[PDB]
Write an enzyme that holds these catalytic residues in place. Structure first.
Site, short mmCIF file in Angstrom:
data_model
loop_
_atom_site.label_atom_id
_atom_site.label_comp_id
_atom_site.label_asym_id
_atom_site.label_seq_id
_atom_site.Cartn_x
_atom_site.Cartn_y
_atom_site.Cartn_z
N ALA A 165 0.31 3.07 12.51
CA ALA A 165 -0.78 3.96 12.13
C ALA A 165 -0.33 4.94 11.05
O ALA A 165 -0.36 6.16 11.23
CB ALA A 165 -1.34 4.69 13.34
N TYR A 196 -4.69 -0.82 -5.11
CA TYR A 196 -3.39 -0.15 -4.88
C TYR A 196 -2.71 0.31 -6.16
O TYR A 196 -2.40 -0.51 -7.03
CB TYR A 196 -2.42 -1.04 -4.08
CG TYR A 196 -2.87 -1.42 -2.68
CD1 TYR A 196 -3.92 -0.76 -2.05
CD2 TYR A 196 -2.21 -2.42 -1.97
CE1 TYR A 196 -4.33 -1.11 -0.77
CE2 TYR A 196 -2.61 -2.77 -0.69
CZ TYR A 196 -3.67 -2.11 -0.09
OH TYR A 196 -4.06 -2.46 1.18
N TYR A 228 8.60 14.37 2.26
CA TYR A 228 8.71 12.96 1.84
C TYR A 228 8.13 11.96 2.84
O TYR A 228 8.37 10.75 2.73
CB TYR A 228 10.15 12.60 1.45
CG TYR A 228 10.80 13.66 0.60
CD1 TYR A 228 11.87 14.41 1.08
CD2 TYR A 228 10.32 13.94 -0.68
CE1 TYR A 228 12.45 15.40 0.31
CE2 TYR A 228 10.89 14.93 -1.46
CZ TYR A 228 11.96 15.65 -0.96
OH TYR A 228 12.54 16.63 -1.73
N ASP A 259 1.29 -8.77 0.92
CA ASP A 259 -0.08 -8.33 0.74
C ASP A 259 -0.19 -7.20 -0.27
O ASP A 259 0.61 -6.26 -0.29
CB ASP A 259 -0.66 -7.87 2.07
CG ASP A 259 -2.12 -7.53 1.97
OD1 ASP A 259 -2.51 -6.46 2.49
OD2 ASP A 259 -2.88 -8.30 1.35
N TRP A 299 0.82 -1.20 0.00
CA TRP A 299 0.00 0.00 0.00
C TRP A 299 0.87 1.27 0.00
O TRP A 299 1.89 1.35 0.70
CB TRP A 299 -0.98 0.00 1.18
CG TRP A 299 -1.87 1.21 1.21
CD1 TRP A 299 -2.48 1.79 0.15
CD2 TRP A 299 -2.24 1.98 2.36
NE1 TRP A 299 -3.20 2.89 0.55
CE2 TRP A 299 -3.07 3.02 1.91
CE3 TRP A 299 -1.94 1.90 3.73
CZ2 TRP A 299 -3.62 3.98 2.77
CZ3 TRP A 299 -2.49 2.85 4.59
CH2 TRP A 299 -3.32 3.87 4.11
N1 NAP Z 1 -6.93 -4.70 4.82
C1 NAP Z 1 -6.92 -3.38 4.57
O1 NAP Z 1 -8.09 -2.66 4.29
C2 NAP Z 1 -5.61 -2.65 4.60
C3 NAP Z 1 -5.58 -1.26 4.77
C4 NAP Z 1 -4.36 -0.59 4.78
C5 NAP Z 1 -3.18 -1.32 4.63
N2 NAP Z 1 -3.22 -2.69 4.46
C6 NAP Z 1 -1.99 -3.47 4.26
O2 NAP Z 1 -1.15 -3.38 5.39
C7 NAP Z 1 0.10 -2.83 5.07
C8 NAP Z 1 0.41 -1.89 6.22
O3 NAP Z 1 1.04 -0.76 5.70
P1 NAP Z 1 0.81 0.66 6.38
O4 NAP Z 1 1.07 1.66 5.33
O5 NAP Z 1 -0.48 0.66 7.11
O6 NAP Z 1 2.00 0.57 7.46
P2 NAP Z 1 2.40 1.40 8.79
O7 NAP Z 1 3.27 0.55 9.63
O8 NAP Z 1 1.22 1.88 9.55
O9 NAP Z 1 3.20 2.63 8.14
C9 NAP Z 1 4.18 2.41 7.16
C10 NAP Z 1 4.61 3.77 6.64
O10 NAP Z 1 5.16 4.58 7.68
C11 NAP Z 1 6.51 4.93 7.44
N3 NAP Z 1 7.46 4.12 8.25
C12 NAP Z 1 7.61 2.75 8.19
N4 NAP Z 1 8.58 2.34 9.03
C13 NAP Z 1 9.09 3.43 9.65
C14 NAP Z 1 10.10 3.57 10.60
N5 NAP Z 1 10.76 2.50 11.06
N6 NAP Z 1 10.43 4.83 11.06
C15 NAP Z 1 9.76 5.93 10.57
N7 NAP Z 1 8.75 5.78 9.64
C16 NAP Z 1 8.41 4.55 9.17
C17 NAP Z 1 6.80 4.54 5.99
O11 NAP Z 1 7.01 5.55 5.00
P3 NAP Z 1 6.78 7.15 4.99
O12 NAP Z 1 8.15 7.78 4.98
O13 NAP Z 1 6.09 7.56 3.70
O14 NAP Z 1 5.98 7.60 6.19
C18 NAP Z 1 5.67 3.60 5.57
O15 NAP Z 1 5.17 3.90 4.29
C19 NAP Z 1 -0.06 -2.17 3.71
O16 NAP Z 1 1.11 -2.21 2.91
C20 NAP Z 1 -1.20 -2.95 3.08
O17 NAP Z 1 -0.75 -4.08 2.38
C21 NAP Z 1 -4.41 -3.35 4.44
#
Ligand code: NAP
Ligand code: NAP
Ligand code: NAP
Lengths: 326, 119, 69, 326, 326
Positions: free
Chosen positions: E212, E55, E227, E50, E22
């Site tokens: 989150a 997406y 970014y 996933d 995502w």
């Molecule tokens: N079932 C559903 O309806 C549903 C919904 C949403 C997601 N999902 C799935 O679940 C996955 C969860 O992804 P999410 O985007 O929700 O993940 P998240 O853990 O909530 O956030 C990830 C984002 O935060 C930033 N980040 C990640 N690690 C970091 C770190 N160690 N230190 C500082 N910033 C960090 C990253 O880039 P940035 O620099 O851009 O912030 C990244 O894009 C998705 O890829 C998707 O496949 C499913």
């Protein structure tokens, strides 16, 4: 008496002897030997050939497949079985999950160069996969026409009963066969527990290791011969059994049985193999052989079969001392 | 816990296997004995018998040994069922005396067998 | 032994075919007579009748002739 | 009256006469004759063609297949049936096991050059295969779209009832048809037992050997003509029937029936074939013919059908003396 | 402790951490980064990936597909999931109708260059499609071998229970998994409602957004970094959350949690991700990462897991103040 017999109560007809591919195919013996071994078994009427994804990391399947394709035998004349459980190093490459049963059988079928096997086996039980998922996957691959039937291996009665029961619950296909260990020193399961399942739900026993890995041939009397299975790289486990207190207790018992063998005018292996077939509960015995001599001899067990009077049997029972109370 | 389906003339009963294993000498308690009534197609034991009775027969096992004739089942019929299901002579006499039938306000051996002088 | 499903207003009864063949003049004993009530979709004989009674009717056949209300 | 009729209660519509391929196709007659025989039957409205893996060891199927492909007839206009049971010399190449029904039908379908047959038949019952396995396999091949429907041949009522009952048990497809023998000297089954199954579970009778292999044509009055079926290599069994005490008892009865034939102004074969169709219980009669004369004559049985008064029938019944008590 | 675990009670085994696609795949990050990100996750034992048709309008799937095909990883070693619901602008290109589940999955599978996914998800519930139709379609695509299993996402217990119940009603396949949101500020559902479904019908939680959306990384303490996700075109919704009264109430809570982080000698993100896995109810956490630094750090959450005493947990509960009454 009857060279062919229903595998359990299924309509599938098997020679009372089959040829396995454990240790030998793509491993211990050459492909030339394998071919020769199969051609022999086939020309003597054996239609049953057992393999597994695990054997020689797929190579047994490659070799068995090549032979079938080289000889151009009619597929309808062969009964090919393969077992599924250990199919690779990755987490999702083992067990009886829908994913592995499908991916596993498909990989096997590719290696074999066949569109389907006749029976596919759960190679052992899987505590980490619900019965329903396993029975569904087995039923799925049969419906996909990747197998004709399915069977269990090393499952308990309860496990087999559970699989059967789940099939009836969800209108799926019950298993037709349990591939269980059976020789003079391993009797409990095939002699007590399996006949009850046969009478109740028609599951047949297709047994393995009739010579308990060669042990029953008597060849280990004085130790570990060169080029014997116990001598092979990665069969220390067997070498250890052979040279154990219990392993020796057994070889002593072989010497007595050898008397009975020369009296019926047959070799010891022939007696033991014939001994496994002595009861209609056993549908087929899967042979192992590293040469054509070993195999042609083993096929001779059939001639021994009518020589097995109830008194010859009670005699063997006495010397063994391991007849299980039913 | 493995479970068992008993089909009494279309009327389906269900119990656990251990519930039946509680009385191994009875027909339903004994694997070899009940084996004859098993239907592999349906995974159930079929009995072409009296429906109103079985209720109590199964409750006998569940209750750990209570055997009462359902008020709507005749004495002679229910007794035949106990006999078929092989509940045992002990459970049978307890039923006999609970049902309201006494044959022994006795000293066990006196009245019947008696005298040692053949004369 | 072939078996028969008799459905009395949703209440399913099961017996053996020979159990019924024991009284060939009765409706259920007579193939031509009961043929009219057979449901080929469900493989059963349906009767839109009294439920509490049939119990005894079927037991009559099983008991070899006992008929109690 | 009605040239087409539902095969049993299925929605499948068959000409009241079909053309078989036993003895003749790929065997007795040439492929040119076979083609001519089919073209004739087809152009006269017959849509029903019966064959079997066993016939001429597959060659009947090859020939029937070639004709269909040569004439370029629309598949939707044809009703092709094949029977499965004896498919080869190996142990697993016969019977009604899942393995053979699948491998057998597939082999047939290949020979025929068709993607499916309209009805596939169990060619006889199989005591060595559980009903459930057979019904499942039949249901499987239909679902694979290798057949539209399935039928039984030479099964008893109980056997047919059992197949039906098992289908309802496991939610599978019941059989629609029994392919049974029916002629003036073989009546019992089709006249007593089958109508009960028709009314109860809608199974139709597709009958075979209306001329009892040519016997009813009367051609054997003075013995064995050259080029008659009884004269062919490997039909000694029939020659023996024909020249038996009972075989002769029959030919005497043919002479009387011949009187009735000339009175209705038709040939004897036409009467006999028409006699088989006289009751709505029979859905179709499968014809045999070694020439175009034999076939064109036999098709004429239809004109005879309304000439069969209940009194002409009672008359035939008297001379035959073999009317079965119902 | 245990890096792999059954997805719910299914036999499917997943790394306790997965990598999502995502925002990032075919969107925010380059294909080179995506490849690198996958190779990293894979080489560290993660088998769970996933994606979704929605997406990057299919592009995430194209990229994930390319990587798999480039690296030549064995399919049996990977667990690929995709979600279905929003598949295009036309009316019939959204929802959980038989038409869309089939056409949607097929389109996904094509983009991915795969014959099947391991789990297919209803991406959200569909009030406009009867449960029966949805469960049938899911069961259909599994039987077509286009998926191994199916799951729900953002459904309520009742909705999941209903799907399960309908499957049992019609003898179809129940769902194995709910893909639910779970982080320190979103706990209610995964902590109260899902464990009951796990114990009752064996449905597992595969959770999303453990940081989150990056909020829990603490990186938004002083506002919107360039970014960062909140800064990206079309993520104003998130920017708004971050700079809300409640969004700020949260960042204040992060500062306290940061104390606990430095005490266990790990980063805040590692604590939060590890916090999600703290209970056996959660089968896997799907990670998001825009770089290799973010990902390698996040994988480190595993080392934190045994450091999470029941007292460290009660401590986090106090500072958060959002522990849901069960
Ligand atoms: N079932 C559903 O309806 C549903 C919904 C949403 C997601 N999902 C799935 O679940 C996955 C969860 O992804 P999410 O985007 O929700 O993940 P998240 O853990 O909530 O956030 C990830 C984002 O935060 C930033 N980040 C990640 N690690 C970091 C770190 N160690 N230190 C500082 N910033 C960090 C990253 O880039 P940035 O620099 O851009 O912030 C990244 O894009 C998705 O890829 C998707 O496949 C499913
Ligand atoms: N279901 C399962 O989990 C399972 C498990 C194991 C095996 N199996 C199957 O069952 C088959 C049984 O094979 P097995 O290896 O167990 O067979 P076995 O009968 O116990 O032993 C065969 C081995 O002993 C030696 N031997 C064979 N015949 C002999 C003779 N006449 N005189 C002296 N030595 C002789 C042979 O070579 P050496 O010279 O090397 O001793 C041969 O490799 C396998 O091929 C496999 O397909 C199934
Ligand atoms: N379901 C089963 O187990 C089963 C069994 C047998 C047959 N069948 C099917 O049923 C079909 C019935 O064929 P059948 O052989 O039994 O047929 P039939 O009617 O009993 O006899 C046909 C044979 O008799 C001779 N004949 C035919 N018409 C004649 C006529 N008008 N005048 C004089 N002789 C005549 C023909 O050649 P000749 O000159 O050689 O005598 C022909 O080969 C078969 O083709 C087969 O498909 C099914």
């Amino acid at each position: 008496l009857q060279f062919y017999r229903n595998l359990g109560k299924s309509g599938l007809r098997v020679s009372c002897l089959g040829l396995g591919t454990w240790v030998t195919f793509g491993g211990q013996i050459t492909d030339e030997m394998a071919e020769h071994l199969m051609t022999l078994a086939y020309d003597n009427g054996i239609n049953l050939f057992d393999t597994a994804e695990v054997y020689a990391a797929g190579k047994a399947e490659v070799v068995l497949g090549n032979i079938i394709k080289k000889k151009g035998w009619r597929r309808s004349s062969l009964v090919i079985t393969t077992k599924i459980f250990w199919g690779g190093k990755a987490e999702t490459e083992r067990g009886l999950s829908r994913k592995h049963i499908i991916e596993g059988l498909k990989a096997s079928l590719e290696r074999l160069q066949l569109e389907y096997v006749d029976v596919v086996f759960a190679n052992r039980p899987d505590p980490n996969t619900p019965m329903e998922e396993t029975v569904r996957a087995m039923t799925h691959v049969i419906n996909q026409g990747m197998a004709m039937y399915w069977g269990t291996s090393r499952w308990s009665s309860m496990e087999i009963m559970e699989a059967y029961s789940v099939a009836r619950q969800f209108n799926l296909i019950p298993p037709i066969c349990e591939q269980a260990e059976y020789h003079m020193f391993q009797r409990e399961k095939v002699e007590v527990q399996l006949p009850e399942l046969f009478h109740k739900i028609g599951v047949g026993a297709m047994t393995w290791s009739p010579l308990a890995c060669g042990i029953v041939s008597g060849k280990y009397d004085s130790g570990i011969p060169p080029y014997s299975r116990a001598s092979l790289k990665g069969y220390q486990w067997l070498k250890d059994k052979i040279l154990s207190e219990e392993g020796r207790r057994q070889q002593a018992k072989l010497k007595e049985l050898q008397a009975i063998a020369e009296r019926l005018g047959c070799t010891l292996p022939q007696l033991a193999i014939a001994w496994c077939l002595r009861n209609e509960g056993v549908s087929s015995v899967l042979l192992g052989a590293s040469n054509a001599e070993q195999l042609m001899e083993n096929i001779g067990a059939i001639q021994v079969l009518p020589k097995l009077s109830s008194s010859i049997v009670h005699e063997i029972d006495s010397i063994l001392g391991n007849k299980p109370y039913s | 816990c493995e479970r068992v389906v008993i089909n009494i003339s279309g009327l389906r009963f269900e119990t656990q296997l251990k519930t039946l294993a509680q009385f191994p000498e009875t027909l339903l308690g004994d694997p070899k004995k009940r084996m004859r009534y098993f239907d592999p197609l349906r995974n159930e034991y079929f009995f072409d018998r009296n429906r109103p009775s079985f209720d109590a027969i199964l409750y006998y096992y569940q209750s750990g040994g209570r055997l009462r004739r359902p008020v709507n089942v005749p004495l002679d019929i229910f007794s035949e069922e106990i006999r078929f299901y092989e509940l045992g002579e002990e459970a049978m006499e307890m039923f006999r005396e609970d049902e309201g039938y006494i044959k022994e306000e006795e000293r066990p051996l006196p009245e019947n067998e008696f005298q040692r002088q053949v004369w």
